[PDB]
Structures are given as C-alpha cells and as structure tokens.
Amino acid sequence: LWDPTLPMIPSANIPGDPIAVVNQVLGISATSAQVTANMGRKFLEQLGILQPTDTGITNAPAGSAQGRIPRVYGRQASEYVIRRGMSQIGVPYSWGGGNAAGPSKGIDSGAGTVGFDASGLVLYSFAGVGIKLPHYSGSQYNLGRKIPSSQMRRGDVIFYGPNGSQHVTIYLGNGQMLEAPDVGLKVRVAPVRTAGMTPYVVRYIEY
C-alpha cells in the first residue's frame, strides 16, 4: 500500500494559505498564494498574454484539460517548474518544510530545520507559473488532471500511498523523478519507484 523505503504514514498536512515571506526589517509578510499570484502574473507577462482579469493563479478546474496557460506555452511553463525544482537539489529535507517562496521551517519534528518536504518542494516548483497547490500530498492528488501512471510524462506529478497521502515527486522523464525524500537527506533526483505508487499521476500543465 505504501512505498516501504519511506515512513508508512501520511505526509505533513499544513492547512490553508501559510505565510511564506516575513521581512522584519520592512515590516511585511505575505502568504504562499500571494507569492504564487505575483509569480503567475510575471510568467503570463513574459509570455505576452497578461490580462486585467488575471489574478496570476493558473490552475485548471480539477479534471479539466483547459487551464489558463495556453497549450503552446505549456512546455515552457513545465520546464520552468522543473528548473525551479532542480535548482533546489541539495537543500535539506524538513518534515512540513517549504512554501511558495522557498524552503522553510517545518512542523512537528521538522520545526528546527529549514528545508522542503515532498509536497512542499512540489508546491514551490509549480508556484513559479502560478499553479497554486496545497501543502499536503493527499490534497494535491485531488487537483489537476489524472493521467494513467503507465503514461506518465516529464512534468507530471507522481504520488504514493492511499489517497496519494505518503509522498509526491515530479517526474523528469527517462525513469527519474525529483523529490524531497526523508529526514537526513536532501532534495535529489532518484529512479522512479513503483511500490506504493498511485495508479494515476497528476498533470497540472497541459502541452
């Protein structure tokens, strides 16, 4: 039922729209959704397609094959997401860690450690193009569009455990995935594991 290489428990479940940026000097703070909207608007502006109605949030309604980002720009969007995640290789794992702005202090166990957990890394990566994801893998599994796992494609998101609750990674193609794996390790590229994998992956960006 679970990937037996990792703890056989649900991943950290961080509610709502957490504060992502705190600047004590300037006296400001902002949430993950704020940062994500701002990045989404910048991305749309860089494609030449920003509209006054755009908040910057680009998610498709769950199950729809139509999101805000045009299909002709989806490969570019996906590659930007992957670049963002890959830039984090070497950052420590932290249980509960990460927000749309970068690694962060975790929760519970991970309260004294700045880093990413699996769903935190995924949310950070996708935030660069305005795709807003909750900080819990099981909730991430309910968004986006399902693709059969046998047909996973670079940029799709792989899940593990019941309800996708254990672990989540970004598929890179060629049998490799980007993940924040477990305590004492760092964000890494690793071979895809099939044990405990859900029968679908999730696609957030169409192309």
- The rounded distance, in Å, linking the Cα atoms of 181 and 202 is 19
The answer to whether 136 and 13 are in contact (CB under 8 A) is yes
Burial class (CB in 10 A: 0-12, 13-18, 19+), 139: middle
Helix (H, G, I), strand (E, B) or coil at 184: coil
- The rounded distance, in Å, linking the Cα atoms of 133 and 152 is 19
78 contacts: CB under 8 Å, gap ≥ 6: 154, 155, 205, 207
Structure determination method? X-ray
Helix (H, G, I), strand (E, B) or coil at 15: coil
**CA 177 centroid distance within chain:** 13
- Tokens linked to 13: 């479940």
Query: Residue 135, CB half-sphere, CA atoms under 13 Å: how many?
Result: 29
Q: Looking at the domain 1-207, which fold is it?
A: endopeptidase fold (from Nostoc punctiforme) (3.90.1720)
Q: Structure resolution in Å?
A: 1.0
